[PDB]
Amino acid sequence: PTVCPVPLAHTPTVTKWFKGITLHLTATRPTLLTTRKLGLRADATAEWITGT
């Protein structure tokens, strides 16, 4: 084992709205986005995103 360098994606732009957010995301290469709620139901979602 050792330490490998990995890239950091462009920081997303978050736009708020009543009980909701909109992440404008830019990633030249497939970047993983994983979201989950903090309640009884995780409602976990995972997606590999490309482009903008």
Partner: protein, 439 residues
């Protein structure tokens, strides 16, 4: 003195309470769950990884016969073939064109790189929740790690506390768990000995170095057709790789209640759920009798602009008249409002400005200053923002969650019907009585 309360298991959110001993002056008590650790008890059933299908060099009984022995290797497979007459490099290996049998032998072992890239299969049992608590009373703060079961007491050198049980037990881990390079998955792996080829746990062992490896990889040997010596075989793909491709996201990205999964040992830290009943024996030494504490004479509340949000978006002022200079404790006596400051310097006569956060549309709550209670009446507007990076510090109830305008309209609309049916009953009774009297 012993006091009982119910602290909400949400890390980082202080919970404030007032202990009002009759003889003594009231005292503050703020409790924070600095960290929690929901850890189960686990036993390792086996480890699995890529198998190395090792093939021993074939043997030929040159002009005789061979019989398949019974070894105890992992997924051992031995077959015997008839006359082969094999070639290696010199154009011949034997002297009998027939009755020249060959023994094809094959089995599996652990791959050399399995010491890092291997998965461990575990079963979980009832999990015990441990909490680190920072608790402050008056002047004294105390850090203590305790078990939330209602029996095991935590202690800090004068302070005894018992915590729990949790109102509703919960475990993010299913019965069967798999750990791979720190990642945790809830996979219903096959039991030890129930190997199935082409799926997870097709090769199993108690440890990487254990020699009693058992596997079922569906390896089968075929008749050698080519003239040159070689042992053919076909085998199902490694089920470890199949699960690795179709593993899915780990439990670090799927556990609910914001539960941070961790390994070595398996645990779930900073997990926010439920309420912890805590009974605490606060020592009487820290308590200060009312005869020496400044008991304020006359205090009133004037509330500035307020808003119901997670952040401290409310302000108010307490105009007080007291008899001495001291360190009076201020508190809120409602479940839908929490102050920022705990102990405030009180003078002979003056004012103190304080902050508060509420969940109700209307601030209709009693504030207490050195025991003296005053009802603050306000009207908090909806928050301007939509999202915050901070948790809501107070639960939203049903009773104190609707404005007094809505309450007045609803009560008027319902009391109209109630008074109308009452008036109808009264009218019927009066008519009957008038009929009876004038009959």
């Amino acid at each position: 003195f012993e006091h009982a309360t119910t602290v909400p298991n949400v890390p980082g959110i202080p919970y404030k309470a007032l202990v009002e001993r009759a003889g003594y002056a009231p005292l503050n008590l703020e409790i924070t769950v600095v960290s929690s650790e929901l850890t189960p008890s686990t036993n390792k059933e086996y480890v699995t990884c890529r198998f190395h299908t090792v093939i021993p060099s074939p043997q030929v009984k040159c002009c005789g016969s061979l019989e398949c022995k019974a070894s105890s290797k992992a997924d051992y497979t031995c077959r015997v073939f008839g006359g082969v007459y094999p070639f290696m490099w010199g154009g011949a290996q034997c002297f009998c064109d027939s009755e020249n049998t060959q023994l094809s032998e094959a089995y599996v072992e652990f791959a050399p790189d399995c010491t890092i890239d291997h998965a461990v299969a575990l079963k979980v049992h009832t999990a015990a929740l441990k909490v680190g608590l920072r608790i402050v009373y008056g002047n004294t703060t105390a850090h203590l790690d305790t078990f939330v079961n209602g029996v095991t007491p935590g202690s800090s050198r004068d302070l005894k506390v018992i915590a729990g049980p949790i109102s509703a037990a919960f475990s993010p881990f299913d019965h069967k768990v798999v750990i791979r390079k720190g990642l945790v998955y809830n996979y219903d792996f096959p039991e030890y000995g129930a190997m199935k080829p082409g799926a997870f746990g097709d090769i199993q062992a108690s440890s990487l170095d254990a020699t009693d490896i058992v596997a079922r990889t569906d390896i089968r040997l075929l008749k050698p057709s080519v003239k040159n010596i070689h042992v053919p075989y076909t085998q199902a793909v490694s089920g470890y790789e199949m699960w690795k491709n179709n593993s899915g996201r780990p439990l670090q990205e799927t556990a609910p209640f914001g539960c941070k999964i961790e390994v070595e040992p398996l645990r779930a830290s900073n997990c926010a759920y439920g309420h912890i009943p805590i009974s605490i024996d606060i020592p009487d030494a820290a308590f200060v009798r009312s005869s020496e504490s400044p008991t304020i004479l006359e205090v009133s509340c004037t509330v500035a602009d307020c808003i119901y949000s997670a952040d401290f978006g409310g302000s108010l002022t307490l105009q007080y008249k007291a008899d001495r200079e001291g360190h009076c404790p201020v508190h809120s006596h409602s479940t839908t409002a929490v102050l920022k400051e705990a102990t405030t310097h009180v003078t002979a006569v003056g004012s103190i400005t304080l902050h508060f956060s509420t969940s109700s549309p209307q601030a209709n709550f009693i504030v207490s200053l050195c025991g003296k209670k005053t009802t603050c009446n306000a009207e908090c507007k909806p928050p301007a923002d939509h999202i915050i990076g901070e948790p809501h510090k107070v639960d939203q109830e049903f009773q104190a969650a609707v404005s007094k305008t809505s309450w007045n309209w609803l009560l008027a609309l319902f009391g109209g019907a109630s008074s109308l049916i009452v008036v109808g009953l009264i009218v019927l009774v009066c008519s009957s009585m008038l009929i009876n009297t004038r009959r």
